[PDB]
Amino acid sequence: QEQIQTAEREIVGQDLNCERAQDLCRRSLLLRAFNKKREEECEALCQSNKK
């Protein structure tokens, strides 16, 4: 029982919460979407400069 309890504490401690990786993925996606919007805005200023 003492061995099982030690092993249990280890599993609970390993509860792989890949929250950091997931956060980075979320941020990456949001920034990609942000980049796309900002590229559209750059294209609009380029048109004004041509004029």
Partner 1 sequence: MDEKSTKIIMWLKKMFGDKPLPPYEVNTRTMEILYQLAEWNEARDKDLSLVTEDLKLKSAEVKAEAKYLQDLLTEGLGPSYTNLSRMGNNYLNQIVDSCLALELKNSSLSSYIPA
Partner 2 sequence: GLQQCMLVSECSRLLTADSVPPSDSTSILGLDKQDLLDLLPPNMLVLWVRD
Partner 3 sequence: EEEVKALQKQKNLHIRRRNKLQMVESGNRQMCLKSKDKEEETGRAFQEVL
Report the alpha-carbon distance of residue 20 to residue 39 in Å, rounded. 28
Based on the shown chain and the rule CB under 8 A, indicate whether residue 32 belongs to the binding site for partner 2: yes
Partner that binds at residue 37, options partner 1, partner 3, partner 2, none, CB closer than 5 to 8 Å by kind: partner 2
Binding partner 2 (rule: CB under 8 A), the pick from 8, 21, 37, 42 is 37
Residue 1 or 48: the one with the smaller Cβ distance to partner 1 is 1
Is 24 an interacting residue with respect to partner 2 (CB under 8 A)? no
